[PDB]
Each structure stands twice: as structure tokens, then as C-alpha cells.
Design a protein around this ligand. Structure first.
Ligand code: 5CA
Length: 157
């Protein structure tokens, strides 16, 4: 059913012990946080954007709520060294997925991660499932368990 990249994310959820979480590849786009929320009837804040930044020693994953903008200054202080937004080419090289479908798991390398503390305000959130049509629902606590992320104030607001 699922396209390869979506199947890759579903396989990662299964491998990590969260096989009860299901990737869906929908009849409406989920490319942007706005479209993803409309596709599943969620508030945009419940959508998880998985953003990749490149640092001096490696890359980092920032899981940001769809209602927030990642503050590069805050991210830089958290990592403790310079950071720059990954180009679409670097996103593909690093994660195995392309912009619009970057998931929080299943990458070529598990990236140290940070979770936007506002995601903890929702009982369930939806993260990308590997493609611009794929999402999976999970509780914020399950997302933390899946990524090992550290909770942080990431937003510009
Ligand atoms: N040209 C680009 N170069 C680098 N980053 C980009 C580019 N275009 C978009 N992005 C980044 O990728 C983000 C879009 O991916 S996202 O926020 O994680 N959202 C999604 O993947 C949706 N599927 C909802 S789950 C944009 O908000 C932006 O931070």
C-alpha cells in the first residue's frame, strides 16, 4: 500500500516497538503543516515539523509544532555551536527523505533531537510519515520515546 518512504517509516515504528502507530498516506495533501492539519482535522499546532540543521560535529533534528517558527538563535544555544538549515540536498543525504515528508524516525543516522515544548500541550500529535501525503498520529510522550529528544523552548514566539 504505502509508498516506499512511507513503508520505511512504518517499519521504523515497528522496529522500535511502536508498531501500534500507523502511517497513513492520505487522499489530501499533508505537504505543509497547514495542509496536514486540514487532512486530519487537527489544529496546526498538533502537526510536528521535523527540521534538520547542520552543526560542526554532525546534524540535529528539531521537532517543531506547526503553530511555531524555529528560533535559530535558541537552537544554536541549545546545541552549543553554530547551526545552519539543511539544504534540500542535505536533508536527503542525511535522512533518506525529502523536504515535505521528513519524518521524526527512520533516518540514515539517528540524529540528536529537540522537541518543541508546545507539542506537550496536546493529547495526540501528527508527524510526517516520509512523504508529502503521509502522517502518523502519536502522543507527545510516544514521540519523545521514539526520538530520545530533549524538551526545549524552540519557538520564536
Ligand atoms: N527550500 C527549502 N530549504 C530548506 N528548508 C526548507 C525549504 N523549504 C521548506 N523547508 C523547511 O521544511 C519545512 C517543511 O517541512 S515541515 O515543516 O517539516 N512539514 C512537513 O513536512 C509536512 N509534511 C507536515 S508534517 C518548512 O517549514 C521549512 O522549515
Amino acid at each position: 500500500s504505502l509508498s516506499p518512504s512511507a513503508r520505511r517509516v512504518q517499519g521504523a515504528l515497528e522496529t522500535r516497538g511502536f508498531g501500534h502507530l500507523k502511517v497513513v498516506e492520505l487522499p489530501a495533501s499533508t505537504r505543509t503543516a497547514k495542509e496536514a492539519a486540514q487532512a486530519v482535522g487537527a489544529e496546526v499546532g498538533q502537526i510536528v515539523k521535523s527540521l534538520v540543521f547542520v552543526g560542526e560535529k554532525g546534524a540535529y533534528l528539531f521537532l517543531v509544532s506547526g503553530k511555531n517558527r524555529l528560533d535559530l538563535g535558541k537552537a544554536t544555544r541549545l546545541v552549543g555551536g553554530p547551526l545552519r538549515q539543511a539544504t534540500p540536498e542535505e536533508v536527503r543525504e542525511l535522512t533518506g527523505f525529502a523536504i515535505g515528508g521528513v519524518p521524526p524516525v527512520g533516518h540514515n543516522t539517528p540524529l540528536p533531537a529537540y522537541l518543541d515544548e508546545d507539542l506537550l500541550g496536546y493529547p495526540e500529535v501528527w508527524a510526517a510519515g516520509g512523504t508529502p501525503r503521509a502522517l502518523f498520529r502519536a502522543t507527545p510522550k510516544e514521540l519523545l520515546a521514539l526520538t530520545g529528544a530533549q524538551v526545549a523552548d524552540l519557538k520564536e514566539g
